[PDB]
Design an enzyme around this catalytic site. Structure first.
Site, PDB file in Angstrom:
ATOM      1  N   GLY A 132     -38.346 -20.464  19.769  1.00 19.41           N
ATOM      2  CA  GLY A 132     -39.707 -20.928  19.975  1.00 19.41           C
ATOM      3  C   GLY A 132     -40.368 -20.320  21.201  1.00 19.41           C
ATOM      4  CB  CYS A 176     -40.759 -15.202  20.361  1.00 20.48           C
ATOM      5  SG  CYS A 176     -38.969 -14.994  20.189  1.00 20.48           S
ATOM      6  CG  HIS A 214     -40.268 -11.917  15.638  1.00 23.07           C
ATOM      7  ND1 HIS A 214     -40.111 -11.318  16.869  1.00 23.07           N
ATOM      8  CD2 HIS A 214     -40.098 -13.253  15.774  1.00 23.07           C
ATOM      9  CE1 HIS A 214     -39.901 -12.308  17.726  1.00 23.07           C
ATOM     10  NE2 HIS A 214     -39.894 -13.489  17.116  1.00 23.07           N
TER      11      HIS A 214
END
Ligand SMILES: Cc1ccncc1NC(=O)[C@H](C)OC(F)F
Ligand SMILES: Cc1ccncc1NC(=O)[C@H](C)OC(F)F
EC number: 3.4.19.12
Lengths: 304, 304
Positions: free
Chosen positions: A143, A145, A41
């Protein structure tokens, strides 16, 4: 003496954290040998997350669109591929700090440490568990991830988790390092409910053994039970059924303390039925389930 | 979202851990530049610990009696000196992994991370606090002495604790990196009782702010209080008196949540008087006091 929620030393994993940027999205990546692993993503805008077709979105991206930075220096991306929900960015340089490592897919009830990161930089380390409903109860902001979960055996880091999302209920979901989500979760901004968060019975028992080893013994009683009797109580209290496999894993703790596993089950049965009556066990006023029997043995013996 | 007991990433401190042996005693040392810091009781046998005269015991030791090993390689000791309860072993090689660092003496109520070590090797990392009675509630076995406590500000490690002893009650005592014990404890195998372990009120309030930020809000009530009224309740429950300095430190949390500090004091007053009624706050069934207001802001903002 003393018993703490302890995380693995994070140094070997800190040396693998990098920042990945694609377009306007920045998250963390894991640099092992000449590959950088990150959530797919990273290619999405906030608008794309509503209903993303990752294969179609990826066609519009080239190696030069993935900006990878390790500290203050830029890595050259010479290839990219999608494996399930992770992107694998081949770089021209092997990470000199690559530790000995394995990629493992853990089972529910197992614990691991998380090195929370932002912009490729580590913020902190904490211990958590893969819940029976395949969520984790972490501490992650926008932030984070690409932050990873791991266990360490001497010099080998076993990576088991990569953070991908926060459910609308504030719980977390992610993948193994092959990109497969734990549980039924998908990398889409659609409300996905989590199942019953049951208590990890074998871990509670392991933690009661840790409490006895450390001197907290008030909860020991004069009773015993059977697996079937205990399991009727476990059912009533949303606890995982205890099996003979769990009893076998608790064997070393039973041997060290001299407290038969079924006797500790009877103590737990009483704690479930009567509560703690305002008392504490190892500084906790609830029954802790994020220590495995292996964690208890490791901490109680000082394995390095 | 989510709120965890998070430790600082331990890598910068792992690169400083070494093994120190003197005679038959082995513990951990901290290697910074060309000095190795370790507890002075490394020179004692179990028999010496009953009533040690460290100055007299040290006269029988030369540089070559202190065996210092960093991983599998031996460090050459070219000098030794005693500063309070720590030994400073000058070695011929500066630690190449020396991070930017400071030695700080913390106040009670402040938190820090501990990298528990055995034989110079790190076993785990956990977060704890300097209690108001100057003990710490850690997880330390025989061989963990010389393990250190620290905080990190960007790239600077502030070392605040070195582990020296376990009291007969299972709680821990140690020194700052200048060798001065926190509290009245001495490095002798004599029973030394700890004082009242009071609750760190400012930290509980900070953690209630963290709970509101993360959605646990059931404990918010329609009441307010005054510092003097709150402090009568704090006295009754063995909580530290709240001062205007503590109120000032909670200012950013009050500003972000819109909940006046004295209103949060009234919520805490009710929780003390009524208990939790079988409910939880941030996964805890008791009031947590090992998060400072700074820790809450850091974790809630993602400082790296
Ligand atoms: C916001 C946030 C905060 C904490 N942890 C993760 C996220 N991030 C997501 O949920 C991403 C956007 O969705 C994922 F499923 F792809
Ligand atoms: C046993 C042990 C276990 C855990 N932590 C520290 C110790 N060690 C000590 O108490 C040392 C022997 O005394 C110190 F005061 F000099």
């Amino acid at each position: 003496s003393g018993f703490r929620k302890m995380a693995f030393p994070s140094g070997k994993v800190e040396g693998c954290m990098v920042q990945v940027t694609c377009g306007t999205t920045t998250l963390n990546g894991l640099w092992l040998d000449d590959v950088v692993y990150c959530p797919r993503h990273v290619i999405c805008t906030s608008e794309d997350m509503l209903n993303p077709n990752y294969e179609d979105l990826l066609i519009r991206k080239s190696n030069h669109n993935f900006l990878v930075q390790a500290g203050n220096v830029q890595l050259r991306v010479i290839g990219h591929s999608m494996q399930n929900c992770v992107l694998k960015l081949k770089v021209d340089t092997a990470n000199p700090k690559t530790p000995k490592y394995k990629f493992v897919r853990i089972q529910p009830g197992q614990t691991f440490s998380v090195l929370a990161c932002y912009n490729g930089s580590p913020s902190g380390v904490y211990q958590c568990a893969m819940r029976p409903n395949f969520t984790i109860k972490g501490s992650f902001l926008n932030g984070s991830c690409g932050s990873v979960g791991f266990n360490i055996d001497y010099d080998c880091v076993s990576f088991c988790y990569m953070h991908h999302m926060e459910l609308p209920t504030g719980v977390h979901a992610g993948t193994d390092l092959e990109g497969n989500f734990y549980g039924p979760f998908v990398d889409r901004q659609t409300a996905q409910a989590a199942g019953t968060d049951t208590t990890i019975t074998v871990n509670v028992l392991a933690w009661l053994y840790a409490a006895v080893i450390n001197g907290d013994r008030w909860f020991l009683n004069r009773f015993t039970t059977t697996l079937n009797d205990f399991n009727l109580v476990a059912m009533k209290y949303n606890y995982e059924p205890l099996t003979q496999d769990h009893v076998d894993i608790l064997g070393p703790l039973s041997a060290q303390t001299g407290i038969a596993v079924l006797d500790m089950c009877a103590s737990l049965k009483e704690l479930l039925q009567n509560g703690m009556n305002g008392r504490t066990i190892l500084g906790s006023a609830l029954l802790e389930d994020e220590f495995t029997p292996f964690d208890v043995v490791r901490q109680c013996s000082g394995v390095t």
